[PDB]
Design a binder for these strands. Sequence first.
RNA 1: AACUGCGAAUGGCUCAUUAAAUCAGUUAUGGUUCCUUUGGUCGCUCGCCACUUGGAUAACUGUGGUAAUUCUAGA
RNA 2: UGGGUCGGGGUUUCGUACGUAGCAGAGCAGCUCCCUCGCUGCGAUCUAUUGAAAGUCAGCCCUCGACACAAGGGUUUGU
RNA 3: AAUCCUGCUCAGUACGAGAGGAACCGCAGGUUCAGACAUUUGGUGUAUGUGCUUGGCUGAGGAGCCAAUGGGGCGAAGCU
Lengths: 60, 116, 59, 131
Amino acid sequence: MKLNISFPATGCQKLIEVDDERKLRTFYEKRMATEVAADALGEEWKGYVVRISGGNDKQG
Amino acid sequence: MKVELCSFSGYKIYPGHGRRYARTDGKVFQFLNAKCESAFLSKRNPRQINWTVLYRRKHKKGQTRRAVKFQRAITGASLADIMAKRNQKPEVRKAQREQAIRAAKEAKKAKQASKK
Amino acid sequence: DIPGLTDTTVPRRLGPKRASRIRKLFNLSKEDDVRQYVVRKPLNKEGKKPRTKAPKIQR
Amino acid sequence: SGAKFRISLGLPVGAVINCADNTGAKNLYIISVKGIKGRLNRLPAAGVGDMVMATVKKGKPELRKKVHPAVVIRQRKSYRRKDGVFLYFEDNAGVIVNNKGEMKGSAITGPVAKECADLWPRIASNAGSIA
RNA sequence: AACUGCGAAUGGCUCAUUAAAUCAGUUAUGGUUCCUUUGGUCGCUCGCCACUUGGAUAACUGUGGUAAUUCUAGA
RNA sequence: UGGGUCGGGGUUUCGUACGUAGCAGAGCAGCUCCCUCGCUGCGAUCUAUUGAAAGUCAGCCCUCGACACAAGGGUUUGU
RNA sequence: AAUCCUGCUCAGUACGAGAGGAACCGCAGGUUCAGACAUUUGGUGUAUGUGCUUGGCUGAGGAGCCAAUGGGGCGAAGCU
Ligand SMILES: [K+]
Ligand SMILES: [K+]
Ligand SMILES: [K+]
Ligand SMILES: [K+]
Ligand SMILES: [K+]
Ligand SMILES: [K+]
Ligand SMILES: [Mg+2]
Ligand SMILES: [Mg+2]
Ligand SMILES: [Mg+2]
Ligand SMILES: [Mg+2]
Ligand SMILES: [Mg+2]
Ligand SMILES: [Mg+2]
Ligand SMILES: [Mg+2]
Ligand SMILES: [Mg+2]
Ligand SMILES: [Mg+2]
């Protein structure tokens, strides 16, 4: 599952590829336009709360 | 540890429990027990049956302002350039407005000779 | 900073155009040489001379 | 390979089931079940995926007064599927086939039981959905 | 390129339906609607921006999803 | 120490109790110095209290709470 | 006191001009029978358990009862 990350203040959006469910499951069972903290991924995504803005289905 | 299903009542159907109902029109349903199944077959709406999950969230049984704008570089001017331009406020701006008027006033005097 | 994300900030492609959207961005009061304060985008192509391009400001 | 597990039958001889194909037949009257040795007084019964001999009672005249091989694709008796699920359908339905296993018709209305699918690939290809 | 405005309700094809229906001649709308065209009307009203107000969105840059579509999302 | 009997908890069945409250309610009937849009009744049903109420070993599970009772009775048996 | 059959593989193989076309080992299942069992699904259901409901009755409410199980929905346990 891929993650599209965009930071409006600096632009420079980039794509993250993850195959681990636990980093993703913090996002799971959440609706759009809800802000969630991405402290799940490693030690580099810390102090970062992120807003779900959209996505795509397996079929696109 | 199989797929976890949900019933007519919204309850969670563990493996080896209930029945699954496949209609002719292609839709498939699973019921936790004969009570939920008989209610579904008699076309009773689960939103009107009290002990149903759909009823409970329908009646909700048991369960600010923000904005920010950030200065950015714009192609042709770095964030430094815009800040310096907008920091011409302490009469430097007024200094630039007034020299333009006199820089157009003598042109107007030349324009008076060009108009007339 | 996230590597490759929170760095090398991309500029807004092109500045304001309306004669009021430039005043809000640059704190123009009134008739303070409004035309010149508009952002002038420079164009630099190898098979041509350098030149800067200004946009038409509306209202 | 893998053979079909035992399932609850629920369609004895004399059962009139719907015909789910476009052959023009509307119903199918089961007269016997293939592979049934039987027993005194016991009716030969069939479940989904079973090959039966049937005569269409109402339908088109050129199909009526004959014996047709048919395969049960849907059954209304609940049956267990080795993984704990008891599945049953809204009606008893079957399709007309030949002794070789090829469906006389071309399309199937409604779902087809999974047991009938992997046992009869010709029926499976024509199945709109699989239950 | 795109936003906007306009057109796409004309034309072309066929004759299945349809027997006071369609259609033809005649007459009415003092019982209605009408883009456009043309001509009227546009200081007729007493009542801290007007030297010009507000926000977004295209096109555009950038990250993709989908087997596929004149499909589209986020920034 | 024991097993009982109640009680309690658990499980489970059904499906949301009585009462009270509501500017909920098809409407209808009375009071208008009153009200300046109201009040007083009738009214199936609805909502909240309330996954409430009720039952649950009699052949369900655990109690260590309460109560009393439990070294008692009768008939026989010897190489 | 167990019984028989089918499918896969062997194998389009042996055999045969060809058409056709096996078997042994192995694997997966079924039929008839037998002995149980109730976790699951189904049946029963007067736990007369809990709602609904007709007629009547207790002055009404509440709570109930009678109609040889009033009727009906759902139903524990047990049996199956
Ligand atoms: K037989
Ligand atoms: K109540
Ligand atoms: K309630
Ligand atoms: K009952
Ligand atoms: K039952
Ligand atoms: K039972
Ligand atoms: Mg203009
Ligand atoms: Mg006989
Ligand atoms: Mg108890
Ligand atoms: Mg014998
Ligand atoms: Mg009564
Ligand atoms: Mg009463
Ligand atoms: Mg009496
Ligand atoms: Mg009597
Ligand atoms: Mg029942």
